[PDB]
Design a protein around this ligand. Structure first.
Ligand SMILES: [Zn+2]
Length: 76
């Protein structure tokens, strides 16, 4: 019984991630090569900017956070 944290495991917390879409972006979109699916930006009224929901950037490539989490090679 958390005060403000969810007890529903880390499974939801991967999908809750986002990254800000710049005004220089090509139509606010990119494609996930893992599942072959296109992400689109969504407006944020507080900052006055846009955000890519469930999205991650790494080494010049774009992916879904839930997709890339399955392929994250790590040990060091
Ligand atoms: Zn994907």
């Amino acid at each position: 019984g958390g005060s403000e944290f969810s007890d529903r495991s880390n499974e939801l917390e991967i999908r809750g991630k986002y990254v800000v879409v710049p005004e220089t972006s090509q139509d606010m979109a990119f494609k996930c090569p893992i599942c072959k699916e296109t992400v689109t930006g969504v407006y944020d009224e507080e900052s006055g900017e846009w955000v890519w929901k469930n999205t991650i950037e790494v080494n010049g490539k774009y992916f879904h956070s839930t997709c890339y989490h399955e392929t994250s090679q790590n040990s060091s």
